[PDB]
């Protein structure tokens, strides 16, 4: 996928995708986390299709949902087309489903301060998440980066 990706060939990348899923008829979610992520990632590299990308992460994010990479990629769906409310809501449900994941809180506070703006909601988000999981340092890193951006 990385190779034909470098060569930029749409028909062989797509056909090879369908071949990969046909090989995933064996299922059992072996390494598929990054499979779906690179699939939606190149189907992102093409500018169009973003709607069937929404449905794509609805069926995949509906199956897997613990992923927390799909919440980031989908927040990049709504942030890519510019939906601040849709994005924000998806990051909220995301943080509700996977509290242990810093990137969702970080991106959530980012879209808070850059788009809906205000400092208040963002600081609240990073604080509440931090006290949700005290262990990971990436949350203190998040508050520090947010503050230094302020």
């Amino acid at each position: 996928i990385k190779l034909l990706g470098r060569s930029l060939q749409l028909d062989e990348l797509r056909d090879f995708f369908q071949q990969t899923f046909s090989s995933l008829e064996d299922f059992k979610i072996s390494g598929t986390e990054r499979l779906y992520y690179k699939y939606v990632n190149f189907l992102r590299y093409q500018d169009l299709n973003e709607e069937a990308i929404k449905f794509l992460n609805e069926r995949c994010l509906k199956s897997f949902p613990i992923c927390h990479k799909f919440f980031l990629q989908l927040g990049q769906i709504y942030h890519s087309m510019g939906n601040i409310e849709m994005s924000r809501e998806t990051y909220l449900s995301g943080t509700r489903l996977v509290p242990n994941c810093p990137l969702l809180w970080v991106s959530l506070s980012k879209i808070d301060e850059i788009d809906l703006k205000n400092p208040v909601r963002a600081r609240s988000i990073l604080d509440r998440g931090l006290l949700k999981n005290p262990d990971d340092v990436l949350f203190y890193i998040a508050k520090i980066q947010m503050e230094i951006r302020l």
Partner: peptide
Amino acid sequence: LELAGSQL
């Protein structure tokens, strides 16, 4: 209740 906002 849950944390709403914060202002330094």
